[PDB]
Homo-oligomer: 317 residues x 3
């Protein structure tokens, strides 16, 4: 079935942030047996491999923005691959890798499905522009490059000339926000972007959050869903092996709830599993805890249900 | 008071599963001071002691089902004792022991109160038949032996000739489900059993889960409540000394709220505190935590409330 | 603005309870950078230093009530300091110290604003009178001395002749309750005080709790809010370094939601951060975890929103 037909893409890239190890995200997600478990859940899994990311010598910074040609090139490569997966009538599954890869993952998806709606599950908005940013880490800027309403606010940054803004400010829902920069908060308010920060999650409950998110995107008519899951969206008690952990996250339950609900529409068209850094686990159990969580999230995106699952046969015979 | 007049039944039985230690459950629960805490809570506690489970050597498996004669006998002995306690006018308080014992606890209770409704708090449905089981562990099968609709789906199991299905599919509500086998999911959905898996708990909140659970069971008319409580229903962070732990469970708070709402109906007639395995705590602290949580749950069933409690006297005098 | 103008008062007092250390609370919270953090979120902060609590040797018990002259004098000195801060048009921020200091904090606040309402975040009611108390510890009795309806039930305790009940029973809302004494529960139900114990928070969700709390206190008319935050109101998994911890507490997110909702009214006028004891950490990390949770709740009271904040400037220029 279309909802369980998947194209796997390994994106072992870390240059959108300063912390080493996140490029090993595809390796540990694979080692934990992600592909085998998905196949055991009656999925049609095709593996497009791990993208080779060539080292860019003399990748000088654009103002304070670090590794601009490397980040741009890696997303350009990813955009090409995601579009090929989408042309094959499969759901693209990107195993990251830092969140700057969303530039390519979404751009690639929009090339085949321009009517796509984006759910962004993260502690962060990742919407700083190359000029509002204060760290110059591109993993905190991919939404700025993608938004149509920010065309003219993003300067010519090396490695990004291929990029065209493909999503309107009204086509994205944020779930999980708790660490947002002033410039990001300003953009969020001025562009009238829909979001459920942790305050909204506490207020309405994950049930009402998912009802409002799906009605906000699908209300008019069914349209393809791109879910960009940053594992720091969940609390560091579940996903500690991450680069930018923020206390008071979404529980293990809420995350499964979000992903089970998205599966049920049968409209998941693109997925990103981002920011798992296995070198950032204080103990070996902290890595395994994060990896296993990222696996459960992925499995729920393709049908694994807490109430149970069964083959369409008679088990009483 | 009726909802405070209790009769304790200790069931040191472990042969319904393969992990040693669960038989020590009634001892470690008594050693925590359970009886005393209940007395000090204005409860009429009468000790019916611990049941003597006579060892059955050469208990050859029935197909894949392990130690059937032992499990059949233990529950048979438990049914007589539970029925005796119920004839005395006391709430049966069964101390487990593995969940296979729910066979004898409910059948015994049903002999005195045939109209009873069951609230099953577990991570698991325990609804496999001696044929749909892959483990052959009878603690994962007690609901299949008790359901009327599955008469003809259960074969001649040695030790279970005394068993007569005492409840219909409509007379059971599940709360806390998160690890359901395909056979069990097929049973649950074809039998059309009411359930609240963790997905429904997240969607609704425990307030609505209980309002809906109790309305569905008690709406039509007042009826006896049998709460079968598997400590693995609660997340492993509150009850880690259990044989089959599953991540993302009911919190300590939801557990107390379930039992507080059941107390408040004044219709609790049977209680099972199952699967506390003191030999499975990863530290002596993990054992005491599971035991105190199990004690806390039990006290809430018989009136202990988080807002407080007082006697019918003027305290300002 | 009025909601970000603050007068910090240190109240290094411990004789309201037996465990040494709570007097270091103002020190450790200052050392965590509270003053600096508040100024980074556009606050006008004045520090009135730590109150000298000149020793009162010869302070024998009044019945079973411990250190009454010390508890009385500390609250008398605090009341005068809080009123002086209130007269200066600043939100009084009392860093405790044990919760017995609420007598003085609220009496002093009431002196300038007699129309104030109280929000009491705690695991306990702190409503024992000198006659209902079993422990004789005054941190468990502050509310009794303040309620108009309890006048006549308060005996003549040495060091408390300055006290006049300043709040009515209908002007206090409790949140977080889970350990209430029999005498306390009797007072709570007989006076008809609005309370949301952990049972209500479970039933309703913190969103309804806050909506009902702010409507119940401000629905008739807008008046100044006094928030008295006992850190033990949160689960000991976030605030373990405290004198009287109780499991099943308010989560980290719930504490931020309560304070976020209170800040948004723009009526917060007095705040108490009580019961932080840096000697009671089982590990140095449990101490830092407690102070940081206390600091986070505080910044939330003075505007720090999880969704983010921005200045009224064009960040895109
Ligand atoms: O733009 C920035 O560098 C920062 N702004 C807010 C977060 N604190 C680190 C930030 C990035 C997080 C990216 B993320 O982990 O969400 O992929
Ligand atoms: O039939 C089985 O062995 C298995 N089926 C699903 C559960 N995972 C282990 C199972 C049993 C749980 C029993 B219980 O701990 O709930 O008492
Ligand atoms: O009267 C008492 O001592 C006890 N009554 C219930 C609580 N258990 C300890 C008590 C006080 C809590 C004070 B508190 O930490 O809230 O300031
Ligand atoms: Mn991100
Ligand atoms: Mn993030
Ligand atoms: Mn069970
Ligand atoms: Mn179970
Ligand atoms: Mn207190
Ligand atoms: Mn307290």
């Amino acid at each position: 079935a279309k909802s369980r037909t998947i194209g796997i893409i390994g994106a072992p890239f870390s240059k959108g942030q300063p912390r080493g190890g996140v490029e090993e995200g595809p390796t540990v997600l694979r080692k934990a047996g992600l592909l085998e478990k998905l196949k055991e859940q009656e999925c049609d899994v095709k593996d497009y491999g791990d993208l080779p990311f060539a080292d860019i010598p003399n990748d000088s910074p654009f103002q304070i923005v670090k590794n601009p040609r490397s980040v741009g090139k890696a997303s350009e490569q990813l955009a090409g691959k995601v579009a090929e997966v989408k042309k094959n009538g499969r759901i693209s599954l990107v195993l990251g890798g830092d969140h700057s890869l969303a530039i390519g993952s979404i751009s690639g998806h929009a090339r085949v499905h321009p009517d796509l709606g984006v759910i962004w599950v993260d502690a962060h908005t990742d919407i700083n522009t190359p000029l509002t940013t204060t760290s110059g880490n591109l993993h905190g800027q991919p939404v700025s490059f993608l938004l149509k309403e920010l065309k003219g606010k993003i300067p010519d940054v090396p490695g990004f000339s291929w990029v065209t803004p493909c999503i309107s400010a009204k086509d994205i829902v944020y779930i999980g926000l708790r660490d947002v920069d002033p410039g990001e908060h300003y953009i969020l308010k001025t562009l009238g972007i829909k979001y459920f920060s942790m305050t909204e999650v506490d207020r309405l409950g994950i049930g009402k959050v998912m009802e409002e998110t799906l009605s906000y995107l699908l209300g008019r008519k069914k349209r393809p869903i791109h879910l960009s899951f940053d594992v720091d969206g969940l609390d560091p008690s579940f996903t500690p092996a991450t680069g930018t952990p923020v206390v008071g996250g979404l529980t293990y339950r809420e995350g499964l709830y979000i992903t089970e609900e998205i599966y049920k529409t049968g409209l998941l068209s693109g997925l990103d599993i981002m920011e798992v850094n296995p070198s950032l686990g204080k103990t070996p159990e902290e890595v395994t805890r994060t990896v296993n969580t990222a696996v459960a999230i992925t499995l729920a995106c393709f049908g694994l249900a807490r109430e149970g699952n069964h083959k369409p046969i008679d088990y009483l015979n």
